[PDB]
Design an enzyme around this catalytic site. Structure first.
Site, PDB file in Angstrom:
ATOM      1  N   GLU B 423       1.082  -1.159   0.196  1.00 19.96           N
ATOM      2  CA  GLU B 423       0.092   0.022   0.090  1.00 19.96           C
ATOM      3  C   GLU B 423       0.738   1.165   0.051  1.00 19.96           C
ATOM      4  OE1 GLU B 423      -2.497   0.288   3.660  1.00 19.96           O
ATOM      5  OE2 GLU B 423      -1.027  -0.972   4.777  1.00 19.96           O
ATOM      6  N   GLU B 432       4.641   8.793  -3.700  1.00 18.71           N
ATOM      7  CA  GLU B 432       5.272   8.200  -2.451  1.00 18.71           C
ATOM      8  C   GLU B 432       6.161   7.162  -3.063  1.00 18.71           C
ATOM      9  OE1 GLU B 432       2.647   6.698   0.662  1.00 18.71           O
ATOM     10  OE2 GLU B 432       1.356   8.714   0.366  1.00 18.71           O
TER      11      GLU B 432
HETATM   12  N1  LIG Z   1      -1.336   8.328   1.017  1.00 19.16           N
HETATM   13  C1  LIG Z   1      -1.244   7.364   1.769  1.00 19.16           C
HETATM   14  C2  LIG Z   1      -2.268   6.910   2.666  1.00 19.16           C
HETATM   15  C3  LIG Z   1      -2.476   5.977   3.708  1.00 19.16           C
HETATM   16  C4  LIG Z   1      -1.194   5.334   3.739  1.00 19.16           C
HETATM   17  C5  LIG Z   1      -1.133   4.108   4.566  1.00 19.16           C
HETATM   18  C6  LIG Z   1      -0.074   3.299   4.613  1.00 19.16           C
HETATM   19  C7  LIG Z   1      -0.081   2.122   5.628  1.00 19.16           C
HETATM   20  C8  LIG Z   1      -1.250   1.896   6.485  1.00 19.16           C
HETATM   21  O1  LIG Z   1      -1.103   0.502   7.196  1.00 19.16           O
HETATM   22  C9  LIG Z   1       1.143   3.537   3.699  1.00 19.16           C
HETATM   23  C10 LIG Z   1       2.211   2.693   3.762  1.00 19.16           C
HETATM   24  C11 LIG Z   1       3.295   3.345   4.562  1.00 19.16           C
HETATM   25  C12 LIG Z   1       4.412   2.273   5.126  1.00 19.16           C
HETATM   26  C13 LIG Z   1       5.118   1.881   3.753  1.00 19.16           C
HETATM   27  C14 LIG Z   1       6.665   1.731   4.428  1.00 19.16           C
HETATM   28  N2  LIG Z   1       7.495   1.772   3.293  1.00 19.16           N
HETATM   29  C15 LIG Z   1       7.867   2.876   2.418  1.00 19.16           C
HETATM   30  C16 LIG Z   1       8.824   2.680   1.715  1.00 19.16           C
HETATM   31  C17 LIG Z   1       9.611   1.607   2.366  1.00 19.16           C
HETATM   32  C18 LIG Z   1      10.621   0.574   1.768  1.00 19.16           C
HETATM   33  N3  LIG Z   1      10.831  -0.362   2.315  1.00 19.16           N
HETATM   34  C19 LIG Z   1      10.124  -0.751   3.577  1.00 19.16           C
HETATM   35  N4  LIG Z   1       9.008  -0.075   3.755  1.00 19.16           N
HETATM   36  C20 LIG Z   1       8.561   1.040   3.146  1.00 19.16           C
HETATM   37  C21 LIG Z   1       6.688   2.828   5.455  1.00 19.16           C
HETATM   38  O2  LIG Z   1       7.880   3.183   6.506  1.00 19.16           O
HETATM   39  C22 LIG Z   1       5.345   3.126   6.168  1.00 19.16           C
HETATM   40  O3  LIG Z   1       5.112   2.097   7.307  1.00 19.16           O
HETATM   41  C23 LIG Z   1       0.915   4.572   2.798  1.00 19.16           C
HETATM   42  C24 LIG Z   1      -0.041   5.371   2.775  1.00 19.16           C
HETATM   43  N5  LIG Z   1      -0.110   6.558   1.924  1.00 19.16           N
END
Ligand SMILES: Nc1ccc2cc(CCO)c(CC[C@H]3C[C@@H](n4ccc5cncnc54)[C@H](O)[C@@H]3O)cc2n1
Lengths: 300, 625
Positions: B423, B432
């Site tokens: 996501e 993002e």
């Molecule tokens: N506009 C939005 C709206 C809601 C969103 C909700 C979520 C998580 C709801 O449960 C996320 C993901 C956010 C997560 C991804 C993780 N991430 C990003 C790069 C990456 C590389 N490697 C590993 N993880 C990584 C980042 O740390 C966060 O925990 C995005 C949203 N965008």
């Protein structure tokens, strides 16, 4: 009568027997209302204690006029046309109707030839023909696109009247036509109207720049005043003179050729109404916001 | 309730009037501060030296009343654009006098008319007033839908009203506002008081006032129709417009005398209250979004920044997003492992960017209803979220879920995945850096492996919003480029705006991407047919995603997932707004640009005129890798 009358004198009118009608407004201070007064002795005015009649109105007097000898037609700030009547003694002034038909200040009012109907102008842009017996509006006319400045009823025609507005239109009216208005001509906005009493197809109009103009319905103009021409009133002579008012705080009296006969800078504020006495045709009474009732001896 | 006021041009006693107006149920009173027939002189003696007072005492009401209950009105003899110089110079002096008395009393608003084409000197005097003192009063410009000249009765013989249609001419009063608004340099303190006439104009004239800062709607008593019982009501066309104005949360102003003389005056206000009840109630989305209308926010960067506990919490509460993700994995499992291979074949699922594990739970809920055995990896970069994951892994999930504390581009996978689940999408989908993150994770997917989401596409639409333009313009910070605010996108619930053309797709990404040469950089030219006269202030961004096959999410208005509130729209503003006539095409150009450290958007307008290229080399905005 009221204890004290308001500083800003708006209207001054003589009837047949030479009794002076006065309209007043408070345009400043706590209460913004108005009042109507009768003065059988005109030299006594504006002294409240030495008056025949006097009454308080809900709101200010923008304009008024006599209805015959006893009745008084009044243009209110409230957006109402008001008809007051004197009693048989002519000691009190009683409300006959107060109808709230305009959506903004009622600015100008005039009685038609019959004396049973009148026409009113307001900032709401509309012009309304009244039945004074039934106490109702027969016709509501939205001809203009801005404030209705002046409405003048035809002397000897019940169906005809002039109007002028800040849309820069001078309209000739005739309620007999299916399109009753007709645009005459302009330039600087028209601010005051007066029919010629003898010549049925002639009127005069004053503009905001201080120019008085003579118009044949079928043009002569003079730069009389240094500011807006507030009012134009013809004398009661067979060969009538033209009194002209202005915000430059002066009176003029003009001949047939709009040539200056008399001049008075006696007022120290805006000149609002002029009224020629029927007893002495050479006498002319002015009222202004300086609270002066000045009687002028015109060199006739 | 509806916030409503009474308009009067006659106040004999301010105390009695306000008491009556309050009793009728009005929240405020629009009244003159100087008597409207009281013309004043400032040059020519003797009228210059008129003895005072010039108006009423400030002591007649309490400070609280002036600040809350009173709206000032410009005396209508004040004509600063008069052709007469004497009236010009006095109207200037009078306008300053009345405005300065407004500031003195501390009035919350003041009404000025736009009733003609040329208001250049009116604008100059107001603009000069705004720059004189530290006063806080709003300025309501009183402007009608239809100019009084264009609704006068056709009763002048020798001057008939024009029958032949004038599309530009019917929009004349909007151009009055636009010119005045432009001269005053889009002051936050100058709003519209839109006056509704008896006969409404064509929809295009009404649509013209979309995106404009309307604080008031003025309803004359004359426009109200009587019903059988004798009460004032409105036409269905009028009702429809009142419903639109209620969404903008404008204050309603009743003007004119009681034309329904038989009934009480409350009746007018009671009808607005009645209509305010009888509107449809707010849906789940509109309830959540309530508060955030035209509120500019920085787009989230969960790669560069670590999201807070309460941020994850907000996004978990979206029920539709995860039900769709659950359904997508459910459908993928059944397609991959058939009925006979059920207990033999264990599918390797990998949640890439797991947060606090709502997709982990969805992956587990999908596996039970699919009735297929799964091994889960929960890969999360944010070590504060990883705390939440490992406490869940100990207490609930057990050895089935393997919590990994790693960036997905760095992580050396012990085994390859059947399904990767993520996501990583923003409001513009790729903003993002879902493309970059999944590209780096791709190598530990099987040759036949699936990505959820499988596809996503961004959409752009041009908008008119003088409200949002002014809102963006006010985001200038010290110690940076003074136009940098215009060269960065904002995530915003777009409310007071006008969509000038249908959204068209911008950038599309597929996962897995089996391209010999993998380049996420993009260039896209879009041509938007515009059917109205308007002013372009920026482009609204949206997206759609295919999770798996038919199972999709979308924030495209025309295909929006019902109740899904995780993404508001994104806004790409422009430095200088562009006039667009009816029939013209808006041509916009968008670039997705990158190096090894940064990803960013550049954009330009090329038709009907050229903008500067926005955010060149990401000088104002970058997305961190
Ligand atoms: N506009 C939005 C709206 C809601 C969103 C909700 C979520 C998580 C709801 O449960 C996320 C993901 C956010 C997560 C991804 C993780 N991430 C990003 C790069 C990456 C590389 N490697 C590993 N993880 C990584 C980042 O740390 C966060 O925990 C995005 C949203 N965008």
């Amino acid at each position: 009568a009221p204890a004290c009358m308001e500083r800003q004198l708006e209207a001054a009118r003589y009837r047949s027997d030479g009794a002076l009608l006065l309209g007043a407004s408070s345009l400043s201070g706590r209460c913004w209302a108005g009042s109507l007064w009768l003065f059988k002795d005109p030299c006594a005015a504006p002294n409240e204690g030495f008056c025949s009649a006097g009454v308080q109105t809900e709101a200010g007097v923008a304009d008024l006029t006599w209805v015959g000898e006893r009745g008084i037609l009044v243009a209110s700030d409230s957006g109402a046309v008001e008809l007051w009547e004197l009693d048989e003694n002519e000691t009190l002034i009683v409300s006959k109707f107060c109808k709230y038909e305009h959506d903004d200040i009622v600015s100008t009012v005039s009685v038609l030839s019959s004396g049973t109907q009148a026409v009113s102008g307001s900032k709401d842009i509309c012009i309304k023909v009244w039945d004074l017996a039934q106490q109702v509006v027969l016709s509501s006319y939205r001809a203009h696109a801005a404030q209705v400045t002046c409405v003048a009823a035809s002397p000897h025609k019940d169906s005809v009247f002039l109007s002028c507005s800040e849309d820069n239109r001078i309209l000739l009216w005739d309620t007999r036509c299916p399109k009753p208005a007709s645009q005459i001509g302009p330039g600087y906005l028209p601010t005051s109207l007066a029919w010629h009493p003898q010549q049925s197809e002639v009127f005069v109009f004053g503009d905001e720049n201080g120019t008085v103009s003579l118009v044949d319905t079928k043009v002569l103009s003079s730069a009389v005043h240094s500011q807006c021409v507030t009012g134009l009133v013809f004398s009661p002579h067979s060969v009538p003179f033209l009194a002209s008012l202005s915000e430059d705080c002066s009176l003029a009296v003009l001949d047939s050729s709009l040539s200056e006969l008399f001049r008075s800078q006696a007022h120290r504020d805006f000149v609002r109404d002029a009224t020629w006495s029927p007893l002495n045709h050479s006498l002319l009474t002015t009222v202004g916001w300086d609270h002066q009732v000045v009687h002028h001896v015109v060199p006739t | 309730r509806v916030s409503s006021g009474r308009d009067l041009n006659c106040v004999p006693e301010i105390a009695d009037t306000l008491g009556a107006v309050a009793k009728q149920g009005f929240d405020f009173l629009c009244m003159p501060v100087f008597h409207p027939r009281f013309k004043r002189e400032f040059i020519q003696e003797p009228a210059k030296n008129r003895p005072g007072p010039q108006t009423r005492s400030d002591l007649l009401l309490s400070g609280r009343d002036w600040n809350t209950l009173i709206v000032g009105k410009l005396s209508p003899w004040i004509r600063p654009d008069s052709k007469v110089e004497k009236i010009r110079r006095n109207s200037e002096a009078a306008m300053l006098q009345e405005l300065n008395f407004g500031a003195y009393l501390g009035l919350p608003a003041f009404l000025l008319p736009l009733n003609q084409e040329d208001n250049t000197n009116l604008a100059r005097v107001l603009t000069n007033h705004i720059h004189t003192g530290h006063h806080s009063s709003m300025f309501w410009m009183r402007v009608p839908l239809v100019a009084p000249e264009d609704l006068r009765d056709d009763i002048i013989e020798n001057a008939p009203t024009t029958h032949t249609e004038e599309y530009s001419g019917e929009e004349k009063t909007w151009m009055w506002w636009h010119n005045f608004r432009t001269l005053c340099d889009y002051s936050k303190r100058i709003a519209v008081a839109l006056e509704i006439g008896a006969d409404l104009p064509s929809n295009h004239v009404i649509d013209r006032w979309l995106g404009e800062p309307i604080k008031a709607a003025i309803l004359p008593t004359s426009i109200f129709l009587t019903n059988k019982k004798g009460f004032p009501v409105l036409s269905k066309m009028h009702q429809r417009l009142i419903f639109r104005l209620l969404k903008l949360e404008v204050q309603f102003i009743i003007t004119g005398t009681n034309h329904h003389s038989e009934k009480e005056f409350c009746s007018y206000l009671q009808y607005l209250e009645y209509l305010s009840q009888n509107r449809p109630p707010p849906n789940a989305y509109e309830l959540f979004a309530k508060g955030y209308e035209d509120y500019l926010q920085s787009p989230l960067q969960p790669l560069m920044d670590n999201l807070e506990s309460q941020t994850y919490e907000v996004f978990e509460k979206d029920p539709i997003k995860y039900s769709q993700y659950q359904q997508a994995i459910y459908k993928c499992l059944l397609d991959r492992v058939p009925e006979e291979e059920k207990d033999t074949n264990v599918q390797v699922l990998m949640v890439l960017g797991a947060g606090r594990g709502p997709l982990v739970n969805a992956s587990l809920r999908a596996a039970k209803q699919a009735d297929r055995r799964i091994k889960l990896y929960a890969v999360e970069k944010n070590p504060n979220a990883v705390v939440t994951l490992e406490n869940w892994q100990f207490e609930e999930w057990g050895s089935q879920v393997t919590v990994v504390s790693s960036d997905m581009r760095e992580w050396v996978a012990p085994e390859k995945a059947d399904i990767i689940v993520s996501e990583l999408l923003g409001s513009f989908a790729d903003n993002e850096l879902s493309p970059e993150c999944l590209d780096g994770a791709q190598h530990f997917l099987k040759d036949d492996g699936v990505s959820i989401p499988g596809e996503y596409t961004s959409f752009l639409a041009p908008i008119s919003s003088s409200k949002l333009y002014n809102e963006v313009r006010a985001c200038r910070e010290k110690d940076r480029d003074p136009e940098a605010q215009f060269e960065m996108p904002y995530v915003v619930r777009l409310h007071n705006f006008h969509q000038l053309s249908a959204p068209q797709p911008c950038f599309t990404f597929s996962h897995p991407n089996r391209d010999p040469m993998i380049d996420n950089n993009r260039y896209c030219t879009l041509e938007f047919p515009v059917e109205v006269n308007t002013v372009l202030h920026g482009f609204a961004g949206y997206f759609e995603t295919v999770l798996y096959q038919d199972i999709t999410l979308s924030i495209r208005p025309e295909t929006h997932s019902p109740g899904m509130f995780s993404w508001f729209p994104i806004l790409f503003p422009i430095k200088q707004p562009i006039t667009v006539r009816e029939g013209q095409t808006i041509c916009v150009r968008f670039w997705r640009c990158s190096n090894s450290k940064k990803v960013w958007y550049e954009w330009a307008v090329t038709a009907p005129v050229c903008s500067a290229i926005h955010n060149p080399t990401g000088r104002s905005y970058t997305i961190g890798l």
